[PDB]
Design a protein around this ligand. Structure first.
Ligand SMILES: [K+]
Lengths: 403, 379
């Protein structure tokens, strides 16, 4: 019982039936030509080897027909006519069916290999050239900090050609595997116990977003069932679905799990525009990586607007020079000296606070939240020194202080 | 005479490297800057650094240059082994220079590779073993052998990757086209080299007595004549190794040729006929027409619109629709060619509106499919 699989059964039937028929037919023709025509008293005969017959039958099955070798006994020629009628159908059906079966093997099998201490993020759900490029354009964006995270896609499909190109372009840090997060073996293949996080992506344009969110909940169930302590971030197309995954036994937003509910976010963004007309545009621009890139045909308002789009929001620790200021003085100092817009801080449990009043002192190793053109800008808030940098008017000069 | 020394150079280089890998694997089984080098080499061969894009451009050019040097050496030679002092043979000198570059590139790939063992068995590693060590034996003796060097034709199969790393294959159909053409041509050329080696060398188990002096070009022709199943028999193999190779070649390459030609014909058949743009004549009026455009609606329209009992008004009609026109409509358009035009596109795209110069059209007509399944949707 060694032919365990239907395709493998079909393969061995094809190969053996073809080879055994080809070999036996070559034997019959070899007998006919070397024996000669009996009704010519064996006078008409031709001394082929078995191997010349075997070659000649392949040259005729394929319809190549050189005529370097050919039959000349009447029994030989009549056998060649019968052989042509039968074996052209065999060869012409056999070769494509072998080519389909040998073409069936999965390319992106195998498993991810963990580098020494290097972080990786598993990504799954709706994986396509569109969703992957939209994701990677921001995720690998040049204006991010040089963080060595590797991206490990896991999906059931063979990747399309545009995606294969994109994967080859990012080959150093992006990987793809055939499989599904619904199978514990595939989770082991991508070593998800040792992944930094897992992202679950939704097909935003699906025919039923309740069905798509149900499928994505399953996934998170499967991922958490396999290992509870993975940071999972899941995209939800509907708000009402969220309550289900809040009930998962090891779902923990205090541990960093989260749901990006695009419906909740959309309606929140546009509702703030009812309070302050353009605010959805103000705020949406802060949350996407975008380089400032002027061109001289832009009007004043376009050059202004685009400078605004050149912002992202960033997070950095305040230097000890900020300690025991009020949030108001810290914001004044950031804006006036550092050219940074501080707007919120992490307050010791610990919690975010936005524009907090004079009663809130800054404390040592406070994380601050900033609007700026790069991570390189907010660094100034980490290096600032109230002796060593307090008059450095060429702000780009600020670096590690002696004081 | 001495050809087996050239062959042995590839086998000892292959085998010694494989043994060094196997004992190292076993020692590390029984018992940092490494990763920085691997990542740097990976970025370099991927064309991610500018020096990587330069290296990629050199791999591309020097593959083609090496292959042309092989065609020259295969064309202007008689016996497969040939005695000639290296200082006299100019092609054998630039061949060494290319083999040195390919040896450096081989080690750069080796550094970049995630598993050294599987890398030592990747196809291009065999091309390198079967070429570079022989090119050194070709200095150590006053002779050369046109042996496995024909495998240089496989280096062309890198080209679709290079034209991805240099990001010039921007479109899925164009990617598929260049993979098809290059894989077909590189396989055809390398197979012709292998048959050329077999027939000119002769059967080893007949002490090379059975041999046949084909040119490379006769082999290249003969493999096309057999891939296509045309089979003249003006040229044919007569070494037993040649004939057995022809049998294998038939089984493999009929499937290649018979799938390749239709897929090329589909891809080259895909280009849009009615592209381009309308050209505005001096002061002449034109009317853009769009929506439900068909031989039926266009003939119903034009029969009245161009009716002979109207005044002789010089208006030109410019159809704009997404479909390729049906044959009856192509006939009608050719009959009215002097004053009727058609363009592929839609009025939903500002570029197509510019193509038909609609700012300078006299009017635009939008036609409805009166027999549609929902007239609210059509409106
Ligand atoms: K034929």
């Amino acid at each position: 019982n060694v032919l365990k699989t239907s395709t493998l059964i079909r393969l061995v039937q094809l190969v053996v039936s073809f080879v055994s028929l080809w070999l036996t037919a070559a034997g019959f023709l070899h007998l006919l030509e070397n024996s000669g025509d009996p009704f010519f008293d064996f006078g008409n005969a031709q001394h082929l080897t078995y191997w010349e017959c075997l070659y000649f039958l392949m040259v005729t099955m394929s319809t190549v027909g050189f005529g370097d070798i050919f039959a000349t006994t009447v029994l030989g020629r009549t056998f060649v006519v019968i052989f042509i009628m039968i074996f052209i159908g065999l060869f012409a059906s056999f070769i494509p069916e072998i080519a389909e079966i040998l073409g069936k093997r999965q390319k992106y099998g195998g498993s991810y290999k963990k580098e020494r201490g290097k972080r990786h993020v598993v990504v799954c759900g709706y994986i396509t050239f569109d969703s992957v490029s939209n994701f990677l354009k921001d995720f690998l964006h040049k204006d991010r900090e040089d963080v060595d995270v590797e991206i490990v896609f896991l999906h059931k499909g063979l990747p399309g050609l545009e995606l294969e190109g994109l994967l080859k372009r990012h080959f150093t840090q992006v990987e793809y595997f055939w499989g599904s997060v619904m199978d514990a073996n595939d989770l082991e293949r991508v070593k998800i116990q040792e992944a930094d996080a897992c992202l679950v992506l939704a097909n935003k344009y699906c025919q039923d977003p309740d069905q798509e969110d149900a499928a994505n909940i399953m996934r998170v169930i499967s991922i958490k069932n396999y290992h509870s302590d993975i940071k999972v971030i899941v995209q939800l197309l509907q708000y009402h679905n969220k309550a289900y995954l809040l009930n998962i036994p090891s779902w923990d937003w205090k541990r960093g799990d989260d749901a990006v509910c695009v419906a909740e976010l959309k309606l929140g963004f546009i509702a703030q525009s009812c309070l302050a007309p353009g605010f959805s545009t103000l705020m949406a621009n802060l949350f996407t990586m975008r380089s400032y890139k002027p061109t001289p045909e832009m009007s004043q308002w376009q050059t202004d607007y685009m400078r605004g789009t050149g912002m992202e929001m960033y997070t950095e620790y305040l230097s000890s020079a900020f300690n025991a200021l009020t949030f108001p003085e810290a914001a004044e100092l950031c804006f006036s000296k550092l050219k940074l817009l501080l707007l919120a801080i992490e307050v010791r449990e610990s919690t975010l606070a936005i524009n907090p009043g004079p009663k809130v002192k800054i404390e040592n190793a406070t994380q601050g939240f900033f609007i700026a053109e790069s991570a390189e800008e907010v660094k100034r808030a980490f290096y600032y020194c109230k002796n060593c940098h307090a008059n450095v008017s060429d702000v780009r000069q600020i670096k590690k202080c002696k004081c | 005479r001495q050809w087996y020394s050239f062959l042995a150079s590839s086998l000892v280089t292959f085998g010694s490297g494989l043994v060094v890998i196997i004992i190292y694997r076993i020692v590390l089984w029984l018992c940092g800057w490494m990763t920085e080098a691997k990542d740097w080499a990976g970025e370099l061969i991927s064309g991610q650094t500018t020096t990587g894009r330069i290296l990629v451009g050199l791999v591309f050019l020097l593959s083609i240059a090496s292959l042309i040097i092989y065609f020259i050496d295969a064309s202007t030679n008689t016996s497969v082994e040939t005695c000639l002092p290296w200082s006299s043979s100019t092609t054998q000198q630039v061949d060494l220079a290319f083999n040195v570059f390919f040896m450096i590139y081989f080690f750069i790939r080796f550094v970049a590779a995630n598993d050294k063992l599987w890398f030592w068995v990747e196809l291009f590693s065999f091309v390198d073993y079967f070429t570079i060590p022989p090119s050194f034996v070709a200095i150590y003796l006053d002779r050369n052998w046109l042996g496995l060097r024909f495998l240089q034709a496989l280096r062309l199969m890198s080209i679709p990757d290079i034209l991805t790393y240099l990001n010039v294959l921007k479109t899925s159909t164009l990617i598929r086209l260049v993979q098809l053409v290059v894989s077909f041509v590189s396989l055809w050329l390398t197979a012709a080299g292998f048959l050329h080696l077999l027939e000119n060398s002769g059967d080893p188990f007949f002490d090379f007595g059975n041999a046949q002096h084909l040119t490379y070009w006769e082999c290249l022709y003969f493999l096309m004549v057999t891939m296509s199943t045309v089979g003249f028999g003006d040229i044919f193999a007569t070494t037993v190794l040649g004939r057995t190779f022809v049998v294998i070649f038939i089984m493999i390459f009929i499937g290649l040729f018979a799938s390749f030609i239709p897929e090329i014909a589909e891809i080259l058949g895909k280009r849009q006929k009615y592209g381009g743009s309308y050209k505005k004549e001096r002061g002449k009026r034109h009317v853009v027409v769009c929506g439900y455009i068909t031989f039926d609606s266009v003939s119903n329209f034009l029969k009245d619109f161009l009716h002979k009992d109207r005044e002789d008004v010089d208006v030109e009609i410019v159809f704009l629709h997404k479909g390729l026109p049906g044959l009856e409509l192509e006939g009608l358009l050719k009959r009215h060619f002097t004053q009727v035009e058609y363009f592929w596109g839609s009025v939903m795209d500002a570029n197509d509106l510019e193509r038909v110069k609609i700012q300078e059209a006299d009017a635009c007509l939008v036609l409805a499919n009166k027999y549609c399944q929902d007239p609210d949707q059509e409106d």
